[PDB]
UniProtKB/Swiss-Prot annotation, chains A, B:
It is found in: Periplasm. This is Superoxide dismutase [Cu-Zn]. GO terms for cellular component: periplasmic space. Binds 1 copper ion per subunit. Binds 1 zinc ion per subunit. Destroys radicals which are normally produced within the cells and which are toxic to biological systems. May play a role in the interactive biology of organisms with their hosts and so contribute to their capacity to cause disease. Keywords: Antioxidant, Copper, Disulfide bond, Metal-binding, Oxidoreductase, Periplasm, Signal, Zinc. Its cofactor is Cu cation; Zn(2+). Disulfide bonds join 55-151. It comes from Haemophilus ducreyi (strain 35000HP / ATCC 700724). It catalyses: 2 superoxide + 2 H(+) = H2O2 + O2. Homodimer. One of its GO terms (molecular function) is copper ion binding. The lineage of its organism: Bacteria, Pseudomonadati, Pseudomonadota, Gammaproteobacteria, Pasteurellales. Cu cation binds at residues 48, 50, 73, 129.
Amino acid sequence: EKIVVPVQQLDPQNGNKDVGTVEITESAYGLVFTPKLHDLAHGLHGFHIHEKPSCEPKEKDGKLVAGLGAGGHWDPKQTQKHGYPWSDDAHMGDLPALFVMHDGSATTPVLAPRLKKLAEVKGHSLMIHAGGDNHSDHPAPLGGGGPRMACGVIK
Amino acid sequence: EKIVVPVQQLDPQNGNKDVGTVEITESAYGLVFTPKLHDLAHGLHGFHIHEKPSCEPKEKDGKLVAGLGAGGHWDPKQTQKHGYPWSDDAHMGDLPALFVMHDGSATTPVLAPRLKKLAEVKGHSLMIHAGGDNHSDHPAPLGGGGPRMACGVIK
Ligand SMILES: [Cu+2]
Ligand SMILES: [Cu+2]
Ligand SMILES: [Zn+2]
Ligand SMILES: [Zn+2]
């Protein structure tokens, strides 16, 4: 079985747009995230589980900012460090980056070896960023994902 | 402790070009392959350990085939099935696909959770294909990777 996460491209002004789903399954080596997404910007994108079960915007420094309602990276073990999916020093929410092909589709599965059971990711959000992910806070915070492009709540 | 694998772009007629290295390290969750490659074709490429410690071409039907001296996918258990990096029913050498950015660089690390110690992969080859990898023999054999584009021997 699979958790089916509906994902939307975020637009706080005009309303989110559906871009498909990400399926989460259990493998013998951890949780697999299998995207079935469309109409996204081509490239490799930061892909993380964020703390709050929300994809809503929040105002910050006078701005209505996409996805801020999700809070920060999911970090139950309180490492306070963005890092690699296979590093025990990194946020539990840190997943391998997600590849979107030329035609805007994403169908390449990725493994989160530190996550072991479907139950454990529910009540959090799944975030796809505009930027990539160097799995460090240096030199850009949170791997340089930057803006929150697409998001779905894990239920 | 690491293995540094020198990688060459394969051209049996005009000569193989040095395109960098891939560093293999041990993580708490299996082997991590960290590429440091340049001047490769952009996109997502099939990435596997092949059986033989060779990147040499081999004649077939009167023509040299790039990388054919590497033999098939490394499959010590003789599953005879191309599959996911996280599936125990798949070739032991099946790694996550390798992403090359538009500038020709590959620097995105990937985890092979079924591989646990550096000793396991010594005496084999590391292959990068022209095509991608859907982690099945359906609809295309060996994930659709097709031609052998770059290769290094793991020592
Ligand atoms: Cu994020
Ligand atoms: Cu191969
Ligand atoms: Zn993080
Ligand atoms: Zn294979």
